Design a protein around this ligand. Sequence first.
Ligand SMILES: CC1(C)S[C@H]([C@H](NC(=O)[C@H](N)c2ccccc2)C(=O)O)N[C@H]1C(=O)O
Ligand SMILES: [Mn+2]
Ligand SMILES: [Mn+2]
Ligand SMILES: [Mn+2]
Length: 241
Amino acid sequence: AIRPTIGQQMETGDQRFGDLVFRQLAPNVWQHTSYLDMPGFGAVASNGLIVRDGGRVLVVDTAWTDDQTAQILNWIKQEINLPVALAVVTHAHQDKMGGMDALHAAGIATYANALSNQLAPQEGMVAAQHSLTFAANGWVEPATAPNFGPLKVFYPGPGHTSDNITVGIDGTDIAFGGCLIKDSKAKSLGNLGDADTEHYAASARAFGAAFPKASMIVMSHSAPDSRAAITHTARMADKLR
Ligand SMILES: CC1(C)S[C@H]([C@H](NC(=O)[C@H](N)c2ccccc2)C(=O)O)N[C@H]1C(=O)O
Ligand SMILES: [Mn+2]
Ligand SMILES: [Mn+2]
Ligand SMILES: [Mn+2]
């Protein structure tokens, strides 16, 4: 078993594949987990999603590294055996965009918030090949998200970072909050170094309101949780103002 310093531990049902862990969340949704070994600190787990949409697969977030991301693609090849149509990455930090090069090498179309793409070079990341833009209420402009199938992308406002986006999985009760949302028992909001402390609470609540019927909330650094992850995150964020 992989036993990270930060992130959910392994439980029955989890599948180890190389350096990664996969968990099935729904008949057509899996969580991918990759681990950054921080020298002297141990492993930091990061989670994304894999969604089957008929004869194709859609990915949310890379792994920390290109090699780990290539392993995700290998797992998809083995277990699903369908092509990856596109990937969405949820902001311009290593845990979410560290593996862009592996996606590009594989010929997978990549999408991110326009702002994430603009920040990427300043964060030592490679930009996605396509930019998503958003309405004044946070919903993605549909023309910028062509053929996204069940992925419903929502920009909740600045929180964990100014560019953080979130993704609901239509046809399921799952929504993905990325690094914006922390678990219902969290002691902290993680790294606030790039955070908007004024708007964080409202942004967390906006995510909840965008996907009001989602009962399983997936996030970057803990196991899937209830909507209490959203409300607890917002309550922690209320204290920052
Ligand atoms: C897990 C984190 C505390 S670190 C990660 C991210 N940081 C990185 O991706 C850095 N490249 C990094 C540097 C040293 C050790 C780990 C990550 C961030 O600052 O939001 N996301 C944070 C978070 O989601 O709260
Ligand atoms: Mn981050
Ligand atoms: Mn993170
Ligand atoms: Mn402001």
